[PDB]
């Protein structure tokens, strides 16, 4: 038993991380088959980050202007092109450690692991959620750009995020691997702000189920609610509306625990209206919303990879 | 910026995990050079675990009683021995993926990453601290024994923990990689309980420094405390004593932020006595104690590994 904010094992991704340098800027790239993907702002110059003309900056580059290294091994760039906010650097060697992979664009409320890297070297791994406002709350310093977010299933790595920027509230923005930003953000240092950060209701409910599985039952009560009456309370606390689809995907946890979805909703309603009265749930004094229902089932059932 | 509970990248350790089966008991082993290390209770049956005599149980064992699998491949066991509470299974193949490594003994308050595994395969990675009562709060199911905890440093993997057991609060206990338990526990199913948990004061202070570094300053106050008077408060809230050696260890964070260590102690005293008054620190409503001073410096400075 026990329930922790767990990341995917990172070894498949660590074998794809490379260092890309242009001019004096070094950031990270992702090496899959014979292409390295990296944020296009590696070509920016520091006096021209307000509105860079990426088109102009890129067509003036030659392949040798991009220095790519995997570990201490130089990779030779033999082509370069732009796709949205990422560059695709064609290299002369297919990465022999390429896992089975796909590029996925995730939905708000979904979770993934971030392999935070600097100078092409992994430094740490953690679990994040795509917030409803299409930012993430990560841990990223200068030089972390090009670090990726990913899920695994069986032996297939679904890459879903590449890191590009930090917004003033200390929150992070980036693209999918097609190079399109999540949310309305752009890769230039013009003033930009995140929208409303709402709480992911279906994930809070999943985590309440995880709590019951792991022996925390004090919030369970004798009440129920309709979905309508729950959502009326939820909106007042800046929680996203629960839908029938959400109720459906909570089905398996409800069955395993014997607690009906709308009874758990009644427990959550009471927690929202009354707080925890000095108690904790799975070591937290806040209602935790960065576990999906599938994350709970994976961890509580010991699902493994390859 | 940002601050997250970050684990070490797990790939170097993933390459070492194998499955070990004896009879119908299956758990994980650590394959380093030509040795597989695993908990000795793998030789216990369904009824042996109440109060096993491991010398007696090994009378009944030969090499082919240990089925070791690395991925799909059967390793052949050519010797076995008992060392403290682990078995060393000598196999006829050296692990080609053996990293540079060492075995270390950690002390309470120190942190490490756990790669939770089942059947020799990785389920996920998370960061833990060795509690003052020599347990960890992990996420472990039946079959997780033999999963290891580790730190990474420069190029070297420092293994510090191997998982053996769960105590009834959902607390976890295990050994170092020499097979000696952390804490006063034994590998048998006789009633045992850890000492009451206390809070790792030096780590809470480190995490308050992380908060200041990342822009959270609302808890800084104009008050002063002495080490003695602060410890009077710590004892009342079941915090570990803060020593002058701890004060020295916090020196670099104090210098970086301009906040004297005992001034941060005055901030923590007020938090303990009055709570957070509806505010949060680094996204938490409780005082976090599983980041060491070194963890804070390393995350706020972007230290990487290969
Ligand atoms: C890439 O390694 C680095 C990582 C960050 C976590 C710092 N990203 C950048 O440097 C990025 C490059 C630009 C060209 C996309 N810049 C930012 O992320 C920038 C950081 C601040 C501190 C300047 N954020 C930004 O420009 O947000 C837009 C903005 C501008 C002005 C006011 C508010 C918001
Ligand atoms: C190893 O895979 C498995 C992992 C746990 C997470 C289940 N560990 C064991 O099965 C281990 C083997 C024994 C011989 C060391 N047993 C325990 O950890 C046991 C599990 C409970 C659920 C029975 N815990 C235990 O025996 O704690 C001591 C104890 C006994 C009786 C009352 C209180 C405490």
mmCIF file of C-alpha atoms in Angstrom, chain B residues 98-288:
data_model
loop_
_atom_site.group_PDB
_atom_site.id
_atom_site.type_symbol
_atom_site.label_atom_id
_atom_site.label_comp_id
_atom_site.label_asym_id
_atom_site.label_seq_id
_atom_site.Cartn_x
_atom_site.Cartn_y
_atom_site.Cartn_z
ATOM 1 C CA UNK B 98 25.928 -2.612 -14.936
ATOM 2 C CA UNK B 99 26.408 1.091 -14.161
ATOM 3 C CA UNK B 100 29.204 2.592 -12.185
ATOM 4 C CA UNK B 101 27.841 2.141 -8.684
ATOM 5 C CA UNK B 102 28.428 2.009 -4.965
ATOM 6 C CA UNK B 103 26.523 0.794 -1.926
ATOM 7 C CA UNK B 104 25.909 3.454 0.701
ATOM 8 C CA UNK B 105 24.258 3.597 4.088
ATOM 9 C CA UNK B 106 22.066 6.578 4.501
ATOM 10 C CA UNK B 107 20.981 8.299 7.619
ATOM 11 C CA UNK B 108 17.559 9.543 8.730
ATOM 12 C CA UNK B 109 16.483 12.714 7.015
ATOM 13 C CA UNK B 110 18.366 11.849 3.816
ATOM 14 C CA UNK B 111 16.412 11.377 0.574
ATOM 15 C CA UNK B 112 16.601 8.989 -2.349
ATOM 16 C CA UNK B 113 14.613 7.795 -5.352
ATOM 17 C CA UNK B 114 12.771 4.465 -5.432
ATOM 18 C CA UNK B 115 12.220 2.525 -8.672
ATOM 19 C CA UNK B 116 9.129 0.469 -7.828
ATOM 20 C CA UNK B 117 9.212 -2.858 -9.717
ATOM 21 C CA UNK B 118 7.101 -6.030 -10.113
ATOM 22 C CA UNK B 119 8.411 -9.221 -11.778
ATOM 23 C CA UNK B 120 11.662 -7.459 -12.534
ATOM 24 C CA UNK B 121 9.940 -4.712 -14.552
ATOM 25 C CA UNK B 122 9.580 -1.028 -13.599
ATOM 26 C CA UNK B 123 6.279 0.481 -12.528
ATOM 27 C CA UNK B 124 7.450 3.974 -11.684
ATOM 28 C CA UNK B 125 9.850 6.253 -9.849
ATOM 29 C CA UNK B 126 9.388 8.550 -6.904
ATOM 30 C CA UNK B 127 11.404 10.426 -4.265
ATOM 31 C CA UNK B 128 11.433 9.263 -0.581
ATOM 32 C CA UNK B 129 13.084 10.324 2.655
ATOM 33 C CA UNK B 130 14.414 7.994 5.338
ATOM 34 C CA UNK B 131 12.193 9.002 8.262
ATOM 35 C CA UNK B 132 13.590 9.557 11.755
ATOM 36 C CA UNK B 133 11.981 6.277 12.710
ATOM 37 C CA UNK B 134 13.905 4.471 9.897
ATOM 38 C CA UNK B 135 10.868 3.803 7.740
ATOM 39 C CA UNK B 136 9.885 5.275 4.420
ATOM 40 C CA UNK B 137 6.463 6.327 3.128
ATOM 41 C CA UNK B 138 6.520 4.615 -0.245
ATOM 42 C CA UNK B 139 4.131 2.935 -2.675
ATOM 43 C CA UNK B 140 4.723 -0.834 -2.612
ATOM 44 C CA UNK B 141 2.439 -3.810 -3.327
ATOM 45 C CA UNK B 142 2.990 -7.538 -2.886
ATOM 46 C CA UNK B 143 5.830 -8.516 -5.200
ATOM 47 C CA UNK B 144 7.624 -5.152 -4.905
ATOM 48 C CA UNK B 145 10.296 -6.509 -2.559
ATOM 49 C CA UNK B 146 13.764 -6.151 -3.990
ATOM 50 C CA UNK B 147 12.936 -2.753 -5.485
ATOM 51 C CA UNK B 148 15.799 -0.382 -4.654
ATOM 52 C CA UNK B 149 16.334 3.195 -3.625
ATOM 53 C CA UNK B 150 19.287 5.150 -4.974
ATOM 54 C CA UNK B 151 20.924 8.507 -5.513
ATOM 55 C CA UNK B 152 22.926 9.517 -8.553
ATOM 56 C CA UNK B 153 26.103 11.545 -8.315
ATOM 57 C CA UNK B 154 28.312 12.572 -11.149
ATOM 58 C CA UNK B 155 28.300 9.284 -13.023
ATOM 59 C CA UNK B 156 27.773 6.906 -10.174
ATOM 60 C CA UNK B 157 24.648 5.219 -8.872
ATOM 61 C CA UNK B 158 24.705 5.027 -5.055
ATOM 62 C CA UNK B 159 22.283 2.290 -4.020
ATOM 63 C CA UNK B 160 21.061 2.831 -0.484
ATOM 64 C CA UNK B 161 17.830 0.841 0.003
ATOM 65 C CA UNK B 162 16.239 -2.490 -0.858
ATOM 66 C CA UNK B 163 12.575 -3.003 0.007
ATOM 67 C CA UNK B 164 11.507 -5.888 2.288
ATOM 68 C CA UNK B 165 8.325 -5.223 4.173
ATOM 69 C CA UNK B 166 5.249 -3.179 5.053
ATOM 70 C CA UNK B 167 4.228 -2.349 8.610
ATOM 71 C CA UNK B 168 0.555 -1.845 9.383
ATOM 72 C CA UNK B 169 0.375 1.905 9.112
ATOM 73 C CA UNK B 170 1.310 1.492 5.392
ATOM 74 C CA UNK B 171 4.907 2.198 6.405
ATOM 75 C CA UNK B 172 7.799 0.616 4.600
ATOM 76 C CA UNK B 173 10.976 -0.970 5.815
ATOM 77 C CA UNK B 174 14.029 -2.480 4.233
ATOM 78 C CA UNK B 175 17.777 -2.852 4.219
ATOM 79 C CA UNK B 176 20.834 -1.274 2.741
ATOM 80 C CA UNK B 177 22.456 -3.232 -0.067
ATOM 81 C CA UNK B 178 24.628 -5.099 2.435
ATOM 82 C CA UNK B 179 21.409 -6.546 3.802
ATOM 83 C CA UNK B 180 21.317 -4.729 7.158
ATOM 84 C CA UNK B 181 17.950 -3.265 8.111
ATOM 85 C CA UNK B 182 17.331 0.393 8.587
ATOM 86 C CA UNK B 183 15.818 0.581 12.071
ATOM 87 C CA UNK B 184 14.933 -2.055 14.656
ATOM 88 C CA UNK B 185 13.063 -4.331 12.276
ATOM 89 C CA UNK B 186 13.419 -8.027 11.358
ATOM 90 C CA UNK B 187 12.339 -9.946 8.305
ATOM 91 C CA UNK B 188 9.614 -11.973 9.784
ATOM 92 C CA UNK B 189 5.911 -11.644 10.199
ATOM 93 C CA UNK B 190 5.936 -11.044 13.941
ATOM 94 C CA UNK B 191 4.276 -7.963 15.332
ATOM 95 C CA UNK B 192 6.564 -4.946 15.048
ATOM 96 C CA UNK B 193 5.876 -1.244 14.877
ATOM 97 C CA UNK B 194 8.030 1.754 14.084
ATOM 98 C CA UNK B 195 8.584 4.515 16.586
ATOM 99 C CA UNK B 196 6.175 7.420 16.350
ATOM 100 C CA UNK B 197 7.062 9.571 13.306
ATOM 101 C CA UNK B 198 8.595 13.046 13.795
ATOM 102 C CA UNK B 199 9.208 15.874 11.335
ATOM 103 C CA UNK B 200 12.642 16.439 9.817
ATOM 104 C CA UNK B 201 13.200 20.028 10.966
ATOM 105 C CA UNK B 202 16.348 20.798 8.960
ATOM 106 C CA UNK B 203 14.528 19.690 5.789
ATOM 107 C CA UNK B 204 11.510 21.904 6.509
ATOM 108 C CA UNK B 205 13.880 24.842 6.858
ATOM 109 C CA UNK B 206 15.576 23.936 3.569
ATOM 110 C CA UNK B 207 12.178 23.858 1.853
ATOM 111 C CA UNK B 208 11.304 27.298 3.305
ATOM 112 C CA UNK B 209 14.534 28.560 1.735
ATOM 113 C CA UNK B 210 13.446 26.942 -1.555
ATOM 114 C CA UNK B 211 10.177 28.836 -1.199
ATOM 115 C CA UNK B 212 11.968 32.194 -0.828
ATOM 116 C CA UNK B 213 14.198 31.376 -3.799
ATOM 117 C CA UNK B 214 11.055 30.719 -5.863
ATOM 118 C CA UNK B 215 9.246 33.907 -4.819
ATOM 119 C CA UNK B 216 7.215 32.808 -1.771
ATOM 120 C CA UNK B 217 8.134 35.305 0.990
ATOM 121 C CA UNK B 218 4.892 35.871 2.928
ATOM 122 C CA UNK B 219 6.094 33.877 5.947
ATOM 123 C CA UNK B 220 9.206 36.005 6.576
ATOM 124 C CA UNK B 221 8.784 38.034 9.733
ATOM 125 C CA UNK B 222 10.652 40.478 11.864
ATOM 126 C CA UNK B 223 11.089 38.193 14.858
ATOM 127 C CA UNK B 224 14.157 36.488 16.247
ATOM 128 C CA UNK B 225 14.708 33.224 18.069
ATOM 129 C CA UNK B 226 17.514 31.298 19.720
ATOM 130 C CA UNK B 227 18.310 27.681 18.972
ATOM 131 C CA UNK B 228 17.152 26.662 22.458
ATOM 132 C CA UNK B 229 13.845 28.541 22.260
ATOM 133 C CA UNK B 230 13.159 27.265 18.757
ATOM 134 C CA UNK B 231 13.774 23.706 19.950
ATOM 135 C CA UNK B 232 11.271 24.239 22.779
ATOM 136 C CA UNK B 233 8.739 24.847 20.019
ATOM 137 C CA UNK B 234 9.987 21.967 17.839
ATOM 138 C CA UNK B 235 9.581 19.462 20.658
ATOM 139 C CA UNK B 236 5.966 20.464 21.289
ATOM 140 C CA UNK B 237 5.042 19.881 17.618
ATOM 141 C CA UNK B 238 7.008 16.586 17.372
ATOM 142 C CA UNK B 239 9.768 18.064 15.219
ATOM 143 C CA UNK B 240 13.285 16.645 15.465
ATOM 144 C CA UNK B 241 15.760 18.797 17.425
ATOM 145 C CA UNK B 242 17.635 21.321 15.301
ATOM 146 C CA UNK B 243 21.368 21.136 16.087
ATOM 147 C CA UNK B 244 24.182 23.574 15.486
ATOM 148 C CA UNK B 245 25.424 21.128 12.841
ATOM 149 C CA UNK B 246 22.078 21.579 11.074
ATOM 150 C CA UNK B 247 22.523 25.333 11.332
ATOM 151 C CA UNK B 248 25.920 24.967 9.652
ATOM 152 C CA UNK B 249 24.419 22.782 6.917
ATOM 153 C CA UNK B 250 21.805 25.472 6.200
ATOM 154 C CA UNK B 251 24.528 28.139 5.923
ATOM 155 C CA UNK B 252 24.779 28.198 2.101
ATOM 156 C CA UNK B 253 21.012 28.618 1.674
ATOM 157 C CA UNK B 254 21.050 31.355 4.312
ATOM 158 C CA UNK B 255 23.857 33.145 2.442
ATOM 159 C CA UNK B 256 22.155 32.793 -0.940
ATOM 160 C CA UNK B 257 18.868 34.248 0.304
ATOM 161 C CA UNK B 258 20.121 36.776 2.878
ATOM 162 C CA UNK B 259 17.912 35.217 5.592
ATOM 163 C CA UNK B 260 19.770 34.181 8.762
ATOM 164 C CA UNK B 261 19.078 30.578 9.799
ATOM 165 C CA UNK B 262 17.578 31.563 13.156
ATOM 166 C CA UNK B 263 15.411 34.177 11.407
ATOM 167 C CA UNK B 264 14.039 31.341 9.263
ATOM 168 C CA UNK B 265 13.586 29.419 12.506
ATOM 169 C CA UNK B 266 11.517 32.357 13.781
ATOM 170 C CA UNK B 267 9.406 32.112 10.594
ATOM 171 C CA UNK B 268 8.900 28.380 11.141
ATOM 172 C CA UNK B 269 8.010 28.920 14.829
ATOM 173 C CA UNK B 270 5.224 31.307 13.789
ATOM 174 C CA UNK B 271 3.964 28.836 11.153
ATOM 175 C CA UNK B 272 3.890 26.061 13.755
ATOM 176 C CA UNK B 273 2.083 28.227 16.290
ATOM 177 C CA UNK B 274 -0.408 29.956 13.973
ATOM 178 C CA UNK B 275 -0.669 27.940 10.744
ATOM 179 C CA UNK B 276 -0.626 29.427 7.253
ATOM 180 C CA UNK B 277 -3.800 31.576 7.565
ATOM 181 C CA UNK B 278 -5.213 30.245 4.295
ATOM 182 C CA UNK B 279 -1.979 30.621 2.340
ATOM 183 C CA UNK B 280 0.233 27.991 0.716
ATOM 184 C CA UNK B 281 3.961 27.494 0.362
ATOM 185 C CA UNK B 282 5.188 26.008 -2.931
ATOM 186 C CA UNK B 283 1.718 24.641 -3.558
ATOM 187 C CA UNK B 284 1.386 22.900 -0.174
ATOM 188 C CA UNK B 285 -0.791 23.617 2.866
ATOM 189 C CA UNK B 286 1.533 21.697 5.147
ATOM 190 C CA UNK B 287 5.182 21.979 6.033
ATOM 191 C CA UNK B 288 7.180 19.713 3.675
#
